[PDB]
Amino acid sequence: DAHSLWYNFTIIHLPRHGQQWCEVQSQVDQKNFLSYDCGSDKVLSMGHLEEQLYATDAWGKQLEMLREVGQRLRLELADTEPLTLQVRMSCECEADGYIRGSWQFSFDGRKFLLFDSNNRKWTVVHAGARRMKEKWEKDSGLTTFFKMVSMRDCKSWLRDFLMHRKKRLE
Amino acid sequence: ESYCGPCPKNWICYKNNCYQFFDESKNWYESQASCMSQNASLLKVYSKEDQDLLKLVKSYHWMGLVHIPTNGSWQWEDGSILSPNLLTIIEMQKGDCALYASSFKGYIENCSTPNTYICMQRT
Amino acid sequence: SYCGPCPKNWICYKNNCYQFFDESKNWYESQASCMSQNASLLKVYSKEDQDLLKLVKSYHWMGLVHIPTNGSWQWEDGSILSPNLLTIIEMQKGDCALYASSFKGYIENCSTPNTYICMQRT
């Protein structure tokens, strides 16, 4: 079978009211398990406490990266081409291990960019996203950051949550 | 082969300059105060040459850069003015203070919002 | 008050001497490069003594070489990778590790060009 891990970031440039600039919702095999304020290091509502995903080495590493990804996207959001950047990072392991790592970028609810970590291809989804693609495609550091975190780090937490999800059962 | 200038205890010595990163989040004022209480100041960028290791830095941190309410230019704590050739300033948030970010970039931030910081001490 | 003996223009911290090379080369080449200047690649032996390593961004070759038979790793100088120092991230087939921020080592193809870190203490 196949398993996935979805991280949905909501990054805001110039927050207006009591809005937090960083928010992240996560799902293991399509369903929720953590809502996290990546800006103040705070778990807000990690529903699904019957698998103790926390109490895994991956848990803290995971939060570490969630914060780093949030900070990188923040700076990038600050020099774009209040602005709300919604990003979904995902990785999925098949029956072999064929991990598909990809990113999805939106700016106001309309998909803008898609990153295929595997093939490392930036593909435009919106006419107005042609420039950010260029910038980020040329920002080899950013693009590699997107490949490394989704192709390895994310597969790593997936593996540990799963390996842990079983040892309990069997 | 040689030695690297006099620097406080356990501080990154490079090109005769001393740095120290604090994981403690303070606002600009609170940070600036911290560096002062250690015979040092907040990071100051004068040379991409003498301070190239700055493009090695991960995350954003307070630097001793402030905004002048009138002429709209930026100056360091010491009074000198930012020289056209070192930093690229992008607005991240309101404020009159600037955070440093890897690859000589200065991000504008609310002077009162808590952040990590970098104390320096020109040898 | 004085940071241990180091070459000219090399990062010195707690008497260790580091040097980050912007040039992108493969492990083998990175190895030689350090080698060619009385230094090794980068050996992590202490989280405390080598604290600054958690402020570094990007990925850089380290002096790690593994024996894909014990799944273990060892440094160039023959010493083993003590436990509880590096969180090795395992997608493989690769046989080299890239140091990454906050004591991590990503395994990668040894022939993939990459920036690297040379170290020299004393």
Side-chain angles (χ1 to χ4, degrees), chain B residues 1-8 10-15 21 23 53 55-58 61 102, chain C residues 1-14 20 22 52 54-57 101 120:
Chain B
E1 308 192 312
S2 46
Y3 287 99
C4 189
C7 284
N10 305 333
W11 282 37
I12 300 166
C13 191
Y14 182 73
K15 257 78 169 308
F21 296 58
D23 289 285
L53 84 171
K55 73 182 189 177
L56 235 72
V57 191
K58 161 195 273 191
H61 318 256
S102 173
Chain C
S1 55
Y2 264 101
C3 197
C6 292
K8 317 182 207 185
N9 300 12
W10 265 45
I11 296 181
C12 186
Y13 174 97
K14 297 193 187 172
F20 294 69
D22 271 292
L52 82 167
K54 42 180 272 295
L55 294 314
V56 173
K57 75 179 297 192
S101 202
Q120 182 190 79

Side-chain angles (χ1 to χ4, degrees), chain B:
Chain B
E1 308 192 312
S2 46
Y3 287 99
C4 189
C7 284
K9 191 183 182 299
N10 305 333
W11 282 37
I12 300 166
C13 191
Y14 182 73
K15 257 78 169 308
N16 290 167
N17 274 320
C18 321
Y19 312 77
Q20 175 63 302
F21 296 58
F22 303 74
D23 289 285
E24 204 178 317
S25 296
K26 296 171 181 304
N27 63 48
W28 195 81
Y29 319 112
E30 310 179 312
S31 299
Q32 181 205 206
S34 182
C35 298
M36 290 194 314
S37 73
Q38 294 188 303
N39 298 180
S41 68
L42 246 14
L43 175 77
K44 183 195 173 180
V45 179
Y46 63 92
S47 165
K48 303 186 173 185
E49 357 255 54
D50 287 273
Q51 301 168 303
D52 48 38
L53 84 171
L54 250 31
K55 73 182 189 177
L56 235 72
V57 191
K58 161 195 273 191
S59 198
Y60 38 82
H61 318 256
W62 282 132
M63 68 183 311
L65 192 61
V66 304
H67 199 197
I68 294 167
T70 55
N71 64 58
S73 81
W74 301 79
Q75 54 164 46
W76 307 102
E77 302 184 66
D78 64 32
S80 42
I81 172 178
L82 176 70
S83 311
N85 44 40
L86 306 172
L87 295 169
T88 302
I89 295 190
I90 312 172
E91 184 186 311
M92 176 179 89
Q93 191 75 210
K94 24 183 156 61
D96 309 303
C97 294
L99 288 178
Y100 174 73
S102 173
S103 196
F104 301 87
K105 288 197 183 307
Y107 286 103
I108 305 168
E109 165 81 283
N110 186 326
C111 292
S112 68
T113 62
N115 280 289
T116 56
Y117 54 110
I118 301 170
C119 291
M120 193 177 111
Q121 185 179 64
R122 185 67 181 88
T123 304

Side-chain angles (χ1 to χ4, degrees), chain C residues 57-76:
Chain C
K57 75 179 297 192
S58 194
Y59 317 85
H60 317 269
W61 286 126
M62 308 175 63
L64 222 48
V65 304
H66 86 142
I67 331 76
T69 31
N70 215 322
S72 62
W73 297 79
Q74 59 167 50
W75 304 97
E76 287 177 271

Side-chain angles (χ1 to χ4, degrees), chain A residues 108-122:
Chain A
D108 284 315
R110 66 284 280 299
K111 290 192 183 180
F112 245 64
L113 241 55
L114 282 185
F115 182 68
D116 178 315
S117 303
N118 305 295
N119 309 305
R120 202 161 195 296
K121 179 193 282 187
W122 279 105

Side-chain angles (χ1 to χ4, degrees), chain C residues 3-106:
Chain C
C3 197
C6 292
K8 317 182 207 185
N9 300 12
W10 265 45
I11 296 181
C12 186
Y13 174 97
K14 297 193 187 172
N15 308 325
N16 282 308
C17 314
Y18 307 94
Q19 173 47 293
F20 294 69
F21 295 97
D22 271 292
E23 247 176 52
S24 195
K25 53 212 300 176
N26 73 72
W27 192 84
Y28 305 115
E29 292 182 297
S30 293
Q31 222 260 62
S33 191
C34 295
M35 234 279 273
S36 71
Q37 46 191 63
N38 218 52
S40 268
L41 222 20
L42 155 58
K43 179 186 175 190
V44 177
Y45 66 92
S46 167
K47 288 188 166 181
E48 278 72 43
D49 276 54
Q50 303 178 293
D51 214 41
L52 82 167
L53 292 187
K54 42 180 272 295
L55 294 314
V56 173
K57 75 179 297 192
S58 194
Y59 317 85
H60 317 269
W61 286 126
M62 308 175 63
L64 222 48
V65 304
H66 86 142
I67 331 76
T69 31
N70 215 322
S72 62
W73 297 79
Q74 59 167 50
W75 304 97
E76 287 177 271
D77 71 31
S79 60
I80 244 183
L81 175 69
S82 301
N84 311 295
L85 292 172
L86 237 50
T87 289
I88 302 301
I89 307 301
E90 240 88 35
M91 219 275 180
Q92 256 178 307
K93 266 310 188 296
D95 268 38
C96 281
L98 285 161
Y99 173 73
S101 202
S102 223
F103 300 93
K104 293 168 65 187
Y106 292 82

Side-chain angles (χ1 to χ4, degrees), chain A residues 138-149:
Chain A
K138 181 165 182 166
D139 187 348
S140 139
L142 222 202
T143 161
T144 43
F145 171 68
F146 290 147
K147 184 182 68 184
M148 294 303 280
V149 184

